[PDB]
Design an enzyme around this catalytic site. Structure first.
Site, PDB file in Angstrom:
ATOM      1  N   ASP A   1      21.808   0.082  -2.160  1.00 30.13           N
ATOM      2  CA  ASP A   1      20.855  -1.008  -1.954  1.00 30.13           C
ATOM      3  C   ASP A   1      21.277  -2.291  -2.679  1.00 30.13           C
ATOM      4  O   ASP A   1      20.976  -2.477  -3.862  1.00 30.13           O
ATOM      5  CB  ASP A   1      19.485  -0.570  -2.411  1.00 30.13           C
ATOM      6  CG  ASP A   1      18.425  -1.538  -2.016  1.00 30.13           C
ATOM      7  OD1 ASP A   1      18.794  -2.588  -1.462  1.00 30.13           O
ATOM      8  OD2 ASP A   1      17.237  -1.234  -2.243  1.00 30.13           O
ATOM      9  N   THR A   2      21.916  -3.206  -1.944  1.00 28.74           N
ATOM     10  CA  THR A   2      22.303  -4.512  -2.479  1.00 28.74           C
ATOM     11  C   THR A   2      21.105  -5.392  -2.819  1.00 28.74           C
ATOM     12  O   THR A   2      21.275  -6.411  -3.498  1.00 28.74           O
ATOM     13  CB  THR A   2      23.202  -5.251  -1.476  1.00 28.74           C
ATOM     14  OG1 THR A   2      22.455  -5.553  -0.292  1.00 28.74           O
ATOM     15  CG2 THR A   2      24.418  -4.406  -1.097  1.00 28.74           C
ATOM     16  N   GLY A   3      19.911  -5.048  -2.355  1.00 24.33           N
ATOM     17  CA  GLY A   3      18.735  -5.821  -2.697  1.00 24.33           C
ATOM     18  C   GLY A   3      18.058  -5.424  -3.991  1.00 24.33           C
ATOM     19  O   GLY A   3      17.128  -6.104  -4.429  1.00 24.33           O
TER      20      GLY A   3
END
Ligand SMILES: CC[C@H](C)CN(C[C@@H](O)[C@H](Cc1ccccc1)NC(=O)O[C@H]1CO[C@H]2OCC[C@H]21)S(=O)(=O)c1ccc(N)cc1
Lengths: 99, 99
Positions: free
Chosen positions: A25-27
């Site tokens: 998850d890059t967020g």
């Protein structure tokens, strides 16, 4: 490897001697895992997202193996609906976004 | 481009003829943007994240340009903490995770 995003980018991780499925998850600033009884000291924290905030336990210097790549750093534990690997560990396994 | 993850992967988007900053979020199934006026019909919908569920307006088949790449897809508008670009649009611009 290369992971496309047609489906959720779930991979197997190994933590505290346990295998789990977690989202790459890059967020997510920091890795947060579903409730689990880790040993050690921790510090309370609150993380915010869609819907508001949840309270989590912040453990430091935790070893997670992500797809055979080892990483060590902050792991949060709390009532998340899904195990999430965040940028703090994604950098350590050499993960980039590409288009 | 290749984007590393030591910082938040924030990019400029253009939607409704307006420029905004948004987060490339592989952990988001859907794209959610902060309150804004968008033309066209919209249906009320509910979406849930780490903290619970929020009411959003769903706009379908919206043009949105992300860091130079065009997508046409569903955009949810409501009280999200930050503008997040989710997989429904990341797939359209050819975005992958690589390590
Ligand atoms: C502020 C940026 C973003 C909203 C933060 N979130 C990560 C995000 O990827 C979550 C991660 C996430 C995935 C799935 C369930 C709950 C959280 N996805 C999300 O909320 O996506 C929503 C939009 O599409 C839908 O698909 C997933 C939920 C909906 S988060 O889960 O709340 C989060 C915040 C802080 C940390 N350290 C770790 C995780």
């Amino acid at each position: 490897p290369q992971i496309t995003l047609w489906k959720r980018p779930l991979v197997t991780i190994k933590i505290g001697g346990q295998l789990k499925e977690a989202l790459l998850d890059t967020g997510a600033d920091d890795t947060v895992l579903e409730e689990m009884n880790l040993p050690g000291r921790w510090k309370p924290k609150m993380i915010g997202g869609v819907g508001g905030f949840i309270k989590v336990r912040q453990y430091d210097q935790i070893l997670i193996e992500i797809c055979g790549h080892k990483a060590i750093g902050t792991v949060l534990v709390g009532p998340t609906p899904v195990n999430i690997i965040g940028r703090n560990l994604l950098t350590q396994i050499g993960c980039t976004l590409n288009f």
